[PDB]
Design a protein around this nucleic acid. Structure first.
Length: 113
RNA sequence: ACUGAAACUGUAGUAGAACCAAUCGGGGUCGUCAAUA
């Protein structure tokens, strides 16, 4: 039950019941008001190409390449001793790769070397 | 070449009116640490 202040002046105008407006005609308009504002202030031809929007979208959607999500480790299995630090050791002596951009959806290799 | 006497500083009057103990905060989560040989 969303109404602007004009719609609340009507609601508080009477102690009798009165029609609420149908917000579902407007929801798409409000979303477009948001989306166009993002296109305009974070200059883009598309809303979906705005970098924090594309990044946020990839977060909510998850990664498409079906690579598993897990902390860096130098072995497919989670081995019981959990030496996740030694992927970072291999990365330091290896290709020194950084955490890829979220909107790029790039996986790490298990051997960062 | 005579102390004046007698007379409640009392009577009426609400320390009260107004004021939100409140604003913000995912019980959350990854690679570091040590320095030589």
């Amino acid at each position: 039950d969303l109404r602007n202040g004009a719609g609340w002046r009507d609601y508080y105008g009477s102690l009798l019941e009165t029609s609420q407006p149908d917000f579902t005609t407007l929801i798409s308009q409000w979303i477009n008001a948001f989306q166009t504002a993002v296109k305009e202030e974070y200059g883009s031809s598309s809303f979906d190409q705005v970098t924090f929007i594309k990044a946020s979208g990839q977060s909510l959607q998850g990664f498409h390449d079906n690579a598993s999500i897990h902390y860096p480790r130098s072995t497919p299995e989670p081995k019981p001793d959990g030496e996740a630090f030694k992927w970072f050791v291999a990365n330091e002596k290896g290709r020194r790769l950084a955490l890829p951009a979220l909107e790029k959806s790039q996986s790490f290799p298990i051997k960062p070397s």
